[PDB]
Design a protein around this ligand. Structure first.
Ligand SMILES: C/C=C/C(C)=C/[C@@]1(C)SC(=O)C(C)=C1O
Ligand SMILES: C/C=C/C(C)=C/[C@@]1(C)SC(=O)C(C)=C1O
Lengths: 403, 404
């Protein structure tokens, strides 16, 4: 059984819907800004990929009271996807064959800390309030959406750091392949806050040399890259069984023709390369069309960028595809990156262009030879690949093809 | 589709630090619940917990344990036990694409999240945070922290679904085997025990608060005077394995996973709907040609929650219902670890031919009328058992495990 994408929705640093995102991508436009909050917290990195949207009022009071930002972004993305897929309430609500798999990387460090802070104050439990569990818990994104959308099928979160939402999409596909669901909403969200960001800064993973020029901070494949730029936001796609989509006349973006999920079994925070090779090969099994474009994980870290470039080489040899790292524009939204980047790749597929890998002033010599596109290029694409690798050695790749 | 069997297990819980200690506690109806000075001192109203009674110092290598929170530690130790209990050696499971790991927690690590924030706000900032908080604090700590040292090359991610977490992990492991993608998947989870997390459940009124002077009686599923669940910590891990692969190596097989239910209420955030659980149980029983001999209920010792599940059980089974016991009355609610720990208690009951008692029922709730709630340890020859895990957000998991 075959799985296709029939709707998408997105809230990111570069746009609050697929149209705004489309524009940003075609224009090579950065969503990175200076963050007083990060600076005020005592961090060395003072730049981020922020959602440019005040979300107050956009969700019913009785629904949003249970939600952290990760859930808010995913909820809003899911509203867009439902509408983009043309699904009425009666199509998807109160339906055993309709499910939801969506997560975050960090849950909500902000609300974990708030609960602990409140509890140590003069008010104790009355300051904590009864809503922190659903905000702080690691399954908040799925729990907070499944309920108001009246989801009856599967309902849980995958979590795998930077691969989170990619595994969510892959697992949705598996639910379709196993015949258990006709539709699975798949994606994720991530909050943006110093509570989480300082943890990445404390291990040296974030960019710190470019705070005066926020838009030049994220620079995948550039010789002077110094870490990733943390971001937040959300995404959701509608994964749907093929016959079901055709039957209702759904607009199909692409079929998911490949899904790789592997493990390094090596180091905690440095990639092995092996395993990413295996992940991509796994995603290519039975796919006999060439990859026309690869959206790299490409976070703009020294070690990580070239490790992935080496894996791409080993997998593709002398038939390596056009590559770009959209994180040079968007920053790294962690758990939300997989679904957002699938969406970016889906937009490139739909509208026939390759988004630029920006901010390469001096190309890293380990990237010599490869087809890294630094300029918006119109091209008919048929098959695209997107890589998601996280801490803990967890790997995911999605391969999507036009029908 | 391929068949999936459990060929090994491991556990660190309030009622035992391995499967032998746990077996003893279950047959005796021993409580794992103690008074907690940490909880009382935090300013909480619940002063009891299902704590792990183990000095974990020295048990994990220095360079491995440094990335780990308590949930990871408990899961890691449970996984060592499971590997050994399965008769598996490194040459068989390490660096093997067809061997994976699916394990999670409900909350990650509130403790190290708050430690990170506290440390950062101190005078030394980043230097006081140090480079290890992300792996301690991230939601996927449990999978990350085990898959690296155990050299896992197959699938590697966590599932989170609150109180149904490690039950969905097991079912997802089964699905990997059914899809022919993996030969072995280690499945389970862990959960830390700390005021940082526990205070959140107390602030919503979910935790027992009236029985602090009698800790071993606070967790009392189905009793008319229950007042909320007792929070617990610990870990569990089972080895999920493709059937032919297991037989070909002469593995010891506890049971086959013949049913997996996974559904959603789509109702309310913190109150169960009933019809979700009904559907979950029915899905898990689908095609199972034998009756359910025993049911390990979710039964957390909460007023509305306990009786809601009973009403679902009655709808599913009708007059001819199975024997029921709520082991959380002994153990407490280990949240993310609960699903795998209770799958294990159920397997131990399957393997050793008995039903553990639903303890602390001084006065049966009127709404339990006419079900078979087992309140004393009774030896029986069980064939087919069922375990229910329901979580906040209306997330439902049910496992049905049967002897070969
Ligand atoms: C153990 C694996 C670590 C990995 C895949 C790390 C990557 C490449 S994933 C990622 O987002 C960053 C910043 C990295 O450095
Ligand atoms: C929306 C569903 C909420 C559920 C299943 C809540 C339950 C019964 S599950 C659980 O662990 C506790 C303490 C509860 O109160």
């Amino acid at each position: 059984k075959r799985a296709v994408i029939t709707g998408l929705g997105i809230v990111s640093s570069i746009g609050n819907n697929q149209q705004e995102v489309l524009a940003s991508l075609r224009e090579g436009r950065s969503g990175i800004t200076f963050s007083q909050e990060l600076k005020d917290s005592g961090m060395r990195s003072h730049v981020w990929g922020n959602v440019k949207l005040d979300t107050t009022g956009l969700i019913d009071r009785k629904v949003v009271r249970f939600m952290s930002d990760a859930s808010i972004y995913a909820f809003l993305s899911m509203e867009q996807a439902i509408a983009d897929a043309g699904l009425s309430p009666e199509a998807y609500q109160n339906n055993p064959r309709v499910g939801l798999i969506a997560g975050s990387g960090g849950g909500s460090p902000r609300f974990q800390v708030f609960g602990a802070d409140a509890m140590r104050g003069p008010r104790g439990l009355k300051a904590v309030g009864p809503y922190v569990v659903t905000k702080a818990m690691a399954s908040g994104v799925s729990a907070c959406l499944a309920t108001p959308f009246k989801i009856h099928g599967v309902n849980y979160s995958i979590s795998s750091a930077c691969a989170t939402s990619a595994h969510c999409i892959g697992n949705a596909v598996e639910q379709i392949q196993l015949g258990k669901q006709d539709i699975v909403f798949a994606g994720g969200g991530e909050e943006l806050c110093w509570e989480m960001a300082c943890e990445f800064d404390a291990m040296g993973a974030l960019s710190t040399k470019y705070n005066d020029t926020p838009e030049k901070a994220s620079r995948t494949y550039d010789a002077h890259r110094d870490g990733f730029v943390i971001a937040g936001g959300g995404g959701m796609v509608v994964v749907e069984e093929l016959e079901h989509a055709l039957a209702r006349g759904a607009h199909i973006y692409a079929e998911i023709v490949g899904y790789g999920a592997t493990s390094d079994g090596a180091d905690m925070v440095a990639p092995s390369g092996e395993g990413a090779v295996r992940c991509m090969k796994m995603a290519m099994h039975g796919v006999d069309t060439p990859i026309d474009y690869l959206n790299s994980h490409g976070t703009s870290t020294p070690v990580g960028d070239v490790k992935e470039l080496a894996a791409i080489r080993e997998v593709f040899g002398d038939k390596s595809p056009a590559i770009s790292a959209t994180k040079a524009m968007t920053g790294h939204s962690l758990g939300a990156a997989g679904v957002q980047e699938a969406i970016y790749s889906l937009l490139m597929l739909e509208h026939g262009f390759i988004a630029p890998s920006i901010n390469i002033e001096e190309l890293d010599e380990q990237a010599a030879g490869l087809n890294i596109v630094t300029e918006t290029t119109d091209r008919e694409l048929t098959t695209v690949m997107s890589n998601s690798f996280g801490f803990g050695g967890t790997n995911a790749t999605l391969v999507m093809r036009k029908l």
